[PDB]
Ligand binder design. Structure first.
Ligand code: CLA
Ligand code: CLA
Ligand code: CLA
Ligand code: CLA
Ligand SMILES: CC(C)=CCC/C(C)=C\CC/C(C)=C\CC/C(C)=C\CC/C(C)=C\CC/C(C)=C\CC/C(C)=C\CC/C(C)=C\CC/C(C)=C\CC1=CC(=O)C(C)=C(C)C1=O
Ligand SMILES: CCCCCCCCCCCCCCCCCC(=O)OC[C@H](CO[C@@H]1O[C@H](CO)[C@H](O)[C@H](O)[C@H]1O)OC(=O)CCCCCCCCCCCCCCCCC
Ligand SMILES: CCCCCCCCCCCCCCCCCC(=O)OC[C@H](CO[C@@H]1O[C@H](CO)[C@H](O)[C@H](O)[C@H]1O)OC(=O)CCCCCCCCCCCCCCCCC
Ligand SMILES: CCCCCCCCCCCCCCCC(=O)OC[C@H](CO[C@@H]1O[C@H](CS(=O)(=O)O)[C@@H](O)[C@H](O)[C@H]1O)OC(=O)CCCCCCCCCCCCCCC
Ligand SMILES: CCCCCCCCCCCCCCCC(=O)OC[C@H](CO[C@@H]1O[C@H](CS(=O)(=O)O)[C@@H](O)[C@H](O)[C@H]1O)OC(=O)CCCCCCCCCCCCCCC
Ligand code: HEM
Ligand SMILES: CC1=C(/C=C/C(C)=C/C=C/C(C)=C/C=C/C=C(C)/C=C/C=C(C)/C=C/C2=C(C)CCCC2(C)C)C(C)(C)CCC1
Lengths: 31, 182, 483, 175, 30, 131, 30, 79, 31
């Protein structure tokens, strides 16, 4: 499959760079 | 018909040919599995000339690779007598077939219209050649009271090339046939 | 300040920290400008400006840098083309390095202003609450913007003490940098006139200097102070966001339509130069002028520049890429290696045939060959079972004038069927899609990407304008109405 | 004219494949879901604030008390759907947020279609279907349908262009 | 006041991130 | 105007049709014949259309009003070998097809005259349809 | 590796769905 | 029209040929001689004479296997 | 340079998977 190579690394930073932000914000709220 | 509706009793006068095994000589003859429910009865068809009837049955058999073979034969009697012969296998699909890209031979595109010729031209310009198959028909059971003879065959005919896209392989076919000589 | 979407309001009542967080946005903006230009130049191919210009290569910041005056690099080369040895000091690298150094300085200054928030500039003398005088500050800022406008348009664009600006001919072949005299008449409102740009900046610099001086010595009326919530800095944000989204729409429109500020040596042709056949008519007019100058058809058609023929590629229309066909234009059709020449299709009856070019709308198009009458004479069939027309049934031959196939004639059905596909895409060109692993699917230019992004920016800044205007007016009832 | 616009956008733009439009569809369908589910939940968690079987007279404008049990509604949706609203204000902000953001995302998709910046195709599959005349997905059958729409509309859609397509270059599906 | 993010907001944020990423992954891969 | 004027016979005599007569024939085209001749071709066989080029090239030439009425009196082939009035509706054979049992000679004349006084109104919009 | 991204993201939606049902913040009555 | 590659639908074009003449000139194939359609191996005199008028268009050029793969000349499938 | 391809993605997750952990722990301590 002639897919974008960086499409993997675009997919995973698109979805875990915000995610860790949320967890940071949640964890500091819970503590 | 209601007794055979749902059973499958279908699956020189009407000559029916009932395979029960499909060995493809992959790079030895290995036997796959029938993916087209039960529609392989080449039915209602010294030398014998071919005639009408269902002298074609497209059957896809199955590594995990589907092989769509056009099983076909186009072209005294004792329990030893054999009618060995050869037949001309037409292409699996006729030239009015279209691939997923809009292209075809009788009807369709002549090139890939998705992109804008290149190394695609092996799949672009579709060909319609003809293959040969050798069939050896054995005669085992002869009942002249009805006027009919039956026996087994072996036939070696090529599979589909996808209009010249992939190298076909030879399939070995065995099964009983029964005809009414009249 | 407690919801995550409100956190930056912690500096809303802290103007020293507001300046800090602004200087940090400055540091990020300039560091992005420097790093992006460095990345735009690591990936740039300056070997030829004719068939591989910057707009084919996805250059985003490079056109904006070179539009004012910075066209040459320290490597010798130039986007106009000439290599030399003394490229001034203001090259492509110096600009990116200046922005990187500015970014570092601004990061340090934002650190200082975050730490030293409590300076007696941001608190009035009479009480000690944090305040900034928005009418006074606005007047000072408007005056500063006025001098910068007046100066930029009267000394950098005129070239009196500046490089000038990029000017070009209508065909976009003689693109260079020179200082432009101002145009004060009706001619200054011509979108494709650089003196209008120069005069605009001059006149609006005087206008903004006067308004800024008027917004420093005259206090606002008491009805308009409470009417427009002039003490609320949020109201200033709302009006600035208004200016910001309407400028974005104007910038995007003038990039899509093409003005004197976005010439086609930097951002490439517009889709409207393909829609009306602008370069096609230009070349036909030039060709027929040469034909009537006692030259042969092949001799006239070989004085068409490769750069003038390349503009007639529909692959160079910016309305032909896709949203997720990411990247540069040569990631699509590929690297152009040369102009194949004008194809002239002739039927078996010896009639001039023309392939219908495809519009910007169509992803793929039926190849149909017309004549001077405009009746169909050949085509590349689909049904091919009642197809009275067709290349091989009519025996259509293609003969090229100009370019690499000058004088050559082809009559094979495969070859005519191929060059009739390349003829509907405009002037036929040879493409090597091996240098950039090009997939074959067209991509928009930097003109198209900039226009589309700044339209998205206009839309979200319209909403942000509304959000902050409504928040500025309805400040009293934000938490709720009344019990 | 709007129906022509819709089919034009599929055939020329492949607008169903546009993800901003997919979020638009999601926002609008979720807005309708929220409208229906919130109305029925309120109507079925009402309090017995009257005596007649017609419960529409169990509410006064002047009263300052909730006419429906948010606790019973939270219980019901927690044990039916796994989650439920517990905050009434957040519920009604969500009912605002969902169709508005869907509709805005669809507007972003149209802003992209102004410059022809289209999610028309997946390059990997337009490639694979062209190196493999056996690779058929529903996407390849949408690309074919789009070409069929384009060639069979455009000669009377834009009559200033004077598109002449002979009957034998029009993509048929072998009738 | 310090920033918060309660559990419900965390779950909502995680789903909107995860579903939006699943939506745009097919187009980042192209 | 001249659209009303159609070929009557093979001898050659352009006969004009009243507008009301033409409309009356047009209606009866859409009640007993539009079952499978709606558009310009035949649904039973997609090769024998009701077009000018087909009817002139019929054997015998059936692009005439009297020719079409005589066809309706006797269904034959496109060359006219076997008079198969059973596979087709037939003015004589009302038992197989009861659609023309109420149609008089004027009705047959009008339906045969409306088929040959469209093709210069429409052109490529009746012959085989607009693709 | 393009299916791997899709399956990982789908597993992330499923994990968020489990944790937002199973380990949800309790709704307390006032 | 060729009489070894061409279908029944393009035997319409001739002035009065459909369907028996066309259904019999196609049913037996290939024909080597151009004038081999006129022998009429099972046709009658009304077929024989009428075909004997029409000899100025018939041909025996090339039976293409893409055009003969089992009722492709009778119903190609193009309506 | 014939270097390990995944040596990039090994380098960056080796050094930011622990890093976000520390920041989570720090941020929840500071709040
Ligand atoms: C907003 C208005 C504006 C803008 C955007 C520019 C932009 C530019 N000018 Mg300029 N200029 C202006 C107003 C403006 N000017 C006015 C009003 C005058 C009259 C005095 C001039 C006189 C002038 C001269 C004489 C020259 C320029 C030049 C330039 C170019 C190189 C300078 C540079 O980018 O370094 C960016 C600086 C930073 C990012 C700050 C970092 C620096 C710190 C200390 C580190 C650049 C594209 C040079 C040129 O022609 O380019 C080749 C050049 O020689 N300008
Ligand atoms: C005599 C001296 C002089 C001369 C020769 C010019 C010449 C010019 N000025 Mg001008 N100007 C002058 C003095 C002068 N000015 C003075 C003294 C002032 C102070 C008021 C101005 C303030 C001014 C402004 C604010 C603008 C100009 C602009 C222009 C350029 C207009 C051409 C263009 O691209 O259209 C471009 C813009 C328009 C034709 C107007 C667009 C306004 C739209 C229609 C508003 C609605 C759009 C909405 C916000 C968003 C749409 C959403 C959706 C529905 C699409 C032109 C070259 C325009 C420009 O530079 O464009 C880049 C521009 O916006 N001038
Ligand atoms: C409202 C006043 C105004 C307007 C309409 C413009 C318009 C323009 N400027 Mg600009 N400029 C201004 C004020 C203005 N300027 C001021 C106060 C400064 C001092 C920093 C500058 C410094 C500046 C530089 C350095 C450059 C421009 C350039 C441009 C042109 C390219 C940007 C563009 O198309 O979008 C239009 C901009 C808008 C804000 C549109 C919105 C208009 C209202 C708010 C709606 C453009 C026609 C570029 C150019 O091509 O010049 C040769 C360029 O390089 N300007
Ligand atoms: C000059 C532009 C500008 C500025 C200074 C602000 C400033 C502010 N906005 Mg705002 N806004 C804007 C434009 C702007 N907005 C636009 C264009 C929109 C529409 C898209 C909005 C819609 C909006 C809403 C709905 C709200 C605000 C709020 C606020 C206030 C709280 C700050 C905050 O949200 O941090 C918090 C943000 C985060 C912690 C993370 C957000 C991450 C984003 C989504 C991704 C970042 C992208 C990238 C890194 C940024 C580069 C952008 C690039 C395109 C240039 C603050 C005063 C809030 C308010 O009213 O205050 C009480 C509020 O609820 N804004
Ligand atoms: C690939 C693929 C599968 C992905 C699709 C991706 C796709 C395109 C989505 C993108 C989404 C997107 C960002 C678009 C923006 C628009 C947007 C925000 C849409 C979201 C839609 C949305 C979440 C709708 C709500 C759906 C829903 C099931 C809500 C829960 C209903 C709920 C529990 C109410 C119950 C309830 C009702 C009451 O009335 C009361 C009173 C109480 C108490 C109560 O509990
Ligand atoms: C972090 C999350 C990022 C989500 C956004 C990613 C954008 C799509 C990524 C697709 C991709 O493969 O990128 C990788 C491409 C690299 O370039 C591409 O590489 C591919 C990988 O092999 C293929 O080779 C393509 O042919 C080639 O063009 O870079 C981009 O085009 C991204 C441009 C993003 C610009 C955003 C501007 C935002 C404005 C504000
Ligand atoms: C997260 C942080 C991870 C840090 C550790 C990474 C280990 C070295 C990674 C090097 C690498 O390129 O891996 C990638 C290799 C893939 O395999 C290699 O791929 C390379 C990339 O092109 C080259 O092709 C090599 O020739 C090939 O062998 O996978 C591994 O060998 C990792 C094995 C790790 C086993 C750890 C066991 C721990 C026990 C407890
Ligand atoms: C060809 C068809 C013609 C004949 C057949 C009838 C068709 C017409 C529509 C229905 C006829 C019967 C009326 C029922 C309505 C009613 O009273 O209940 C509704 C109750 C009645 O309450 C009560 O309503 C009372 C009167 S009134 O409804 O306020 O007028 C009020 O006094 C009381 O306090 C209040 O509790 O509340 C309302 O009044 C809400 C009105 C909204 C209902 C219509 C929504 C339609 C949208 C979707 C449908 C799509 C369309 C396709
Ligand atoms: C599958 C891989 C993809 C993963 C996708 C899943 C994403 C989850 C994101 C985080 C969501 C949970 C946030 C906090 C919820 C909560 O506080 O729960 C608290 C609960 C107790 O319930 C609670 O307990 C509380 C008291 S106490 O905890 O018992 O002390 C009480 O207050 C409360 O009411 C009660 O509900 O238990 C926990 O401690 C949960 C924290 C576990 C960490 C997240 C899971 C990590 C992944 C596990 C699987 C590893 C995968 C390996 C392969 C890569
Ligand atoms: C009053 C009603 C009708 C009229 C005037 C009419 C007219 C005609 C005519 C003139 C022809 C010969 C045209 C040609 O082949 O060149 C024809 C052929 C044909 N008609 Fe109709 N028709 C009528 C009703 C119908 C109906 C209802 C059917 C539906 C079953 C039908 C099916 C056919 C078919 C299959 C042919 C081709 C048969 C052949 O080749 O001989 N007809 N019709
Ligand atoms: C320290 C210092 C220094 C240095 C500096 C430097 C070196 C720098 C830099 C800088 C840099 C290097 C920068 C930068 C930047 C960039 C940016 C800032 C960007 C961005 C981005 C964005 C914003 C994006 C986002 C996104 C994405 C990812 C895509 C799409 C989507 C989104 C939007 C999400 C000096 C010595 C001088 C001085 C002293 C101090």
């Amino acid at each position: 499959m002639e897919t974008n190579k960086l499409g993997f690394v675009a997919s995973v930073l698109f979805v875990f760079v915000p995610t860790v932000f949320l967890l940071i914000l949640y964890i500091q709220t819970a503590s | 018909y209601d007794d055979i509706r749902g059973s499958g009793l279908a699956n020189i006068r009407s000559l029916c040919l009932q395979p029960q095994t499909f060995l493809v000589e992959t790079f030895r003859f290995v036997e796959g599995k029938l993916l087209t429910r039960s529609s392989f009865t080449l039915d209602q068809v010294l030398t014998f000339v071919e005639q009408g009837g269902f002298d074609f049955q497209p059957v896809t058999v199955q590594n995990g690779d589907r092989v769509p073979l056009l099983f076909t034969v186009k072209g005294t009697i004792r329990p030893s007598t054999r009618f060995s012969g050869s037949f001309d296998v037409p292409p699996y699909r006729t030239s009015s077939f279209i691939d997923p890209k809009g292209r075809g031979l009788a009807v369709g595109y002549d090139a890939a219209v998705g992109i804008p010729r290149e190394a695609f031209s092996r799949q672009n310009n579709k060909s319609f050649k003809v293959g040969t198959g050798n069939i050896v028909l054995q005669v085992d059971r002869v009942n002249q009271s009805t006027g009919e003879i039956s026996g087994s065959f072996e036939s070696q005919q090529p599979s589909d090339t996808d209009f010249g896209s992939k190298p076909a392989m030879t399939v070995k076919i065995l099964g009983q046939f029964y005809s009414r000589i009249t | 300040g407690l919801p995550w979407y409100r956190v930056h309001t912690s500096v809303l009542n802290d103007p020293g920290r507001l300046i800090a967080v602004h200087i940090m946005h400055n540091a990020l903006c300039a560091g992005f400008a420097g790093s992006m230009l460095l990345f735009e130049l690591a990936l740039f191919d300056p070997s030829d400006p004719v068939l591989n210009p910057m707009w084919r290569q996805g250059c985003f910041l490079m056109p904006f840098v070179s539009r004012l005056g910075v066209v040459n690099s320290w490597q010798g080369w130039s986007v106009t083309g000439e290599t030399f040895t003394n490229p001034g000091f203001w090259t492509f690298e110096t600009v990116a390095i200046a922005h990187i150094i500015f970014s570092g300085l601004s990061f340090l200054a934002a650190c200082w202003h975050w730490v030293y928030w409590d300076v007696a500039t941001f608190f009035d003398p009479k009480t000690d609450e944090p305040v900034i005088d928005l009418p006074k500050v606005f007047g000072i800022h408007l005056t500063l913007a006025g001098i910068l406008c007046f100066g930029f348009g009267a000394f950098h664009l005129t070239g009196l003490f500046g490089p000038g600006m990029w000017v070009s001919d209508p065909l976009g072949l003689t693109g260079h940098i020179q200082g432009v005299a101002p145009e004060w008449g009706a001619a200054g409102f011509d979108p494709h006139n650089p003196g209008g740009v120069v005069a605009h900046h001059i006149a609006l610099g005087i206008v903004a200097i006067i308004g800024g001086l008027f917004h420093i010595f005259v206090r606002p009326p008491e009805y308009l102070y409470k009417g427009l919530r002039m003490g609320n800095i949020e109201g200033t944000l709302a009006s600035g966001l208004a200016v910001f989204f309407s400028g974005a729409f104007i910038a995007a429109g003038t990039m899509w339509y093409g003005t004197a500020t976005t010439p086609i040596e930097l951002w490439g042709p517009t889709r409207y130069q393909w829609d009306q056949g602008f370069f096609q008519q230009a070349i036909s007019r030039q060709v027929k002028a040469s034909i009537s100058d006692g030259k042969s058809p092949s001799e006239a058609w070989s004085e068409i520049p490769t750069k003038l023929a390349f503009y007639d590629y529909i692959g160079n229309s910016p309305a032909k890429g896709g949203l997720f066909r990411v990247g540069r234009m040569v990631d699509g059709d590929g690297l152009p290696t040369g102009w194949l020449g004008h194809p002239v299709f002739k039927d078996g009856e010896g009639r001039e045939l023309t392939v219908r070019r495809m519009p910007n709308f169509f992803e793929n198009f039926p190849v149909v060959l017309f004549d001077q009458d405009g009746i169909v004479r050949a085509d590349i069939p689909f049904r091919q079972a009642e197809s009275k027309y067709g290349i091989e049934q009519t025996g259509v031959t293609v003969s090229f004038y100009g370019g690499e196939l000058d004088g050559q004639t082809f009559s094979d059905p495969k070859d005519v069927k191929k060059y009739a596909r390349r003829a509907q895409l405009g002037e036929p060109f040879e493409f090597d899609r091996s240098v950039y692993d090009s997939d074959g699917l067209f991509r928009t230019s930097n003109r198209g990407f900039f226009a589309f992004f700044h339209v998205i920016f206009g839309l979200l800044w319209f909403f942000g304008h509304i959000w902050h205007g409504l928040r500025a007016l309805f400040q009293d009832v934000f938490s709720g109405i009344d019990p | 004219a709007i129906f022509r616009f819709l089919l034009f956008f599929q055939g020329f733009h492949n607008y169903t494949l546009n993800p901003f439009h997919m979020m638009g569809v999601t926002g609008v369908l979720g807005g309708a879901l929220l409208c229906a589910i919130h109305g029925a939940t309120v109507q079925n968690t009402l309090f017995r604030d009257n005596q007649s079987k017609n419960t529409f007279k169990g509410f006064s404008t002047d009263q300052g008390e909730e006419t429906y049990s948010m606790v019973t509604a939270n219980r019901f949706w927690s044990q039916i759907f796994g989650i439920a609203f517990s905050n009434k204000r957040w519920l009604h902000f969500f009912m605002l947020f969902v169709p508005v953001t869907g509709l805005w995302m669809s507007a972003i998709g149209m802003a992209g279609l102004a410059f022809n910046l289209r999610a028309y195709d997946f390059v990997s599959q337009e490639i694979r279907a062209a190196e493999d005349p056996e690779f058929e997905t529903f996407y390849t059958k949408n690309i074919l349908l789009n070409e069929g729409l384009r060639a069979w509309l455009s000669e009377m859609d834009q009559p200033a262009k004077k598109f002449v397509f002979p009957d034998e270059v029009l993509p048929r599906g072998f009738s | 006041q310090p920033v918060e993010l309660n559990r419900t907001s965390l779950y909502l944020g995680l789903l909107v991130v995860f579903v939006t990423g699943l939506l745009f992954s097919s187009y980042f891969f192209n | 105007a001249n659209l009303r004027t159609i070929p009557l016979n093979e001898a050659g005599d352009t006969v004009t049709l009243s507008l009301e007569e033409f409309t009356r024939g047009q209606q009866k085209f859409n009640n007993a014949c539009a079952i499978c001749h709606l558009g310009g071709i035949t649904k039973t066989n997609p090769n024998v259309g009701l077009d000018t080029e087909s009817l002139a090239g019929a054997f015998p030439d059936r692009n005439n009003l009297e020719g079409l009425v005589d066809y309706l009196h006797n269904p034959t082939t496109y060359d006219g070998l076997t008079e198969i009035s059973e596979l087709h509706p037939s003015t004589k054979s009302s038992d197989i097809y009861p659609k023309m049992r109420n149609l008089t000679e004027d009705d047959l004349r009008a339906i045969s005259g409306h088929i040959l006084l469209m093709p210069k109104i429409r052109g490529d919009q009746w012959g085989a349809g607009k693709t | 590796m393009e299916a791997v991204a899709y399956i990982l993201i789908f597993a992330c939606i499923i994990g968020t769905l489990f944790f937002a049902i199973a380990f949800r913040e309790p709704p307390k009555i006032t | 029209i060729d009489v070894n590659n061409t279908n029944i639908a393009a035997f319409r074009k001739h002035r009065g040929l459909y369907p028996t003449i066309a259904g019999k000139v196609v049913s037996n194939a290939p024909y080597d001689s151009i004038e081999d359609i006129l022998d009429i191996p099972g046709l009658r005199e009304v077929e024989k004479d009428r075909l004997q008028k029409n000899m100025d268009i018939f041909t025996i050029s090339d039976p293409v296997p893409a055009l003969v793969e089992g009722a492709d000349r009778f119903n190609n499938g193009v309506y």
